Amino acid sequence: QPDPKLDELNKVSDYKSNKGTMGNVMNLYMSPPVEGRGVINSRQFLSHDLIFPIEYKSYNEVKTELENTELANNYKGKKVDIFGVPYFYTCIIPKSEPFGGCCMYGGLTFNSSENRDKLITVQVTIDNRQSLGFTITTNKNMVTIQELDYKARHWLTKEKKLYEFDGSAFESGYIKFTEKNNTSFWFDLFPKKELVPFVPYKFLNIYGDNKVVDSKSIKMEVFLNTH
């Protein structure tokens, strides 16, 4: 909050104009997410990040960065589950011994006795005229905003061309979350025109706060504007 005005949202046309490739963002939301159940961090690089012995594609470790040290300590040494959007460009993970790797922001929740999936109906509104909707699922009662956001954008990218290689079927837009206590916040769905080359730690850092909500009550709304 408060809801943004058309003028303050990042523009798709402006990214291409600056020689930016929307495909970099498309790849983040179309590629599989890091997913793990019941794991404990093996070590740390910085005091506000945690390295996990979790496998992702050809990687055997994953480093997730948290907004600050206090947030990190809350999960450190504890058995947790992981769900996040990974990146490799600019990802630096020093070996435990004495380089390249897989990185991400937040995405942590505490591991418990797995138990019925929850379905969430994501509300989509285009140019305040057309209404659409789809559903996403998670087994977690307490789920990160990141898990929900990825699943939402993944569907919109695959089904509605939210992100294309050189643009979008839209010009601007944002996703809004509203919790049970009526509090809300949003995310601009597109990259700042200044982000060229695409630097993942300046786009995905919105997940560093590792915000966690109740999947059974959370509300999700997407607003998109055509050209």
User: DSSP states of 130-173 as a string?
Assistant: EEEEEEEEES-SEEEHHHHHHHHHHHHHHHH-SS-SS--SSSEE
As given in the structure block, the two tokens for residue 182 are 């009526």
How would you label 127-138 residue by residue, b for 16+ Cβ within 10 Å and e otherwise? eeeeeeebebeb
What letter does residue 69 receive in the DSSP assignment? Answer: H
Q: Which method resolved this structure?
A: X-ray
DSSP, collapsed to helix, strand or coil, labels residue 103 as: strand
Count each helix (H run) and each strand (E run) in the chain, helices first: 4, 13
197 DSSP assignment: S
The secondary structure element, H or E, covering residue 14 is helix 12-17
* Cα angle, residue 120 at apex, residues 31 and 24 outer, rounded to 5°: 20
All structural domains of the chain? 1-32+116-227 (3.10.20.120), 33-115 (2.40.50.110)
Q: Which string of b and e fits 149-181 if b means at least 16 CB within 10 Å? A: bbbbbbbbbeebebbeeebbebbbbbbbbbeee
The DSSP H or E segment spanning 105 is strand 103-105
Angstrom distance (rounded) from CA 149 to CA 151:
6
